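Page 37, continued from 36.
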């Protein structure tokens, strides 16, 4: 799948905007989602920060949302909504050693609930994203608690998935 890169290190409004434009350009918003061959159903977004840590998010081209991610030798996936997506996600990060699928989904309502007290009005920005990237990475080694992971997913989704969707829709007036 096509890979799009972005780093928070030395990030500017211009680098962030070109990044979102690249994602928007690979989208094909549709009502349903089994209507596309698995070979062109996803877009990979590799994020890296100041500590040089890197994680790769898997975005669904039909809605722009995150279905899962990779951090080193481990991959995590939100609970799939149906069978197309279930078997579809088995085609992501096939060379990774460890694979795990959460019992919960990646929708805002679930994430907000999991974020519990930890986050009441999540702050967005280059700084929060920098920290979110580290949280997602360390989750694979036991240094990230669930509420923190949830908060981090929300930051990535709002700053990437949602930003791309918004621009796509405003594009078609």
């Amino acid at each position: 799948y096509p890979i799009i890169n972005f780093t928070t290190a030395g990030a500017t409004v211009q680098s962030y905007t070109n990044f979102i434009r690249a994602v928007r350009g690979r989208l094909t918003v549709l009502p349903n989602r089994c209507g596309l061959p698995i070979n062109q159903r996803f877009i990979l977004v590799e994020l890296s920060n100041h500590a040089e840590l890197s994680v790769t998010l898997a975005l669904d081209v039909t809605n722009a949302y995150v279905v899962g991610y990779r951090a080193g030798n481990s991959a995590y996936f939100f609970h799939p909504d149906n069978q197309c997506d279930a078997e579809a996600i088995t085609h992501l990060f096939t060379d990774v050693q460890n694979r795990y699928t959460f019992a919960f989904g990646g929708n805002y309502d679930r994430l907000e609930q999991l974020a519990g007290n930890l986050r009441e009005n999540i702050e967005l920005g280059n700084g929060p994203l920098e920290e979110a990237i580290s949280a997602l990475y360390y989750y694979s080694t036991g240094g990230t608690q669930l509420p923190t992971l949830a908060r981090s997913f929300i930051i990535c989704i709002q700053m990437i998935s949602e930003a791309a969707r918004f621009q796509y829709i405003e594009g078609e007036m």
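The first strand starts at residue 3 and ends at 7. Flag for discussion at group meeting. The helical segments are 13-24, 83-88, 108-115, 126-139, 146-171.
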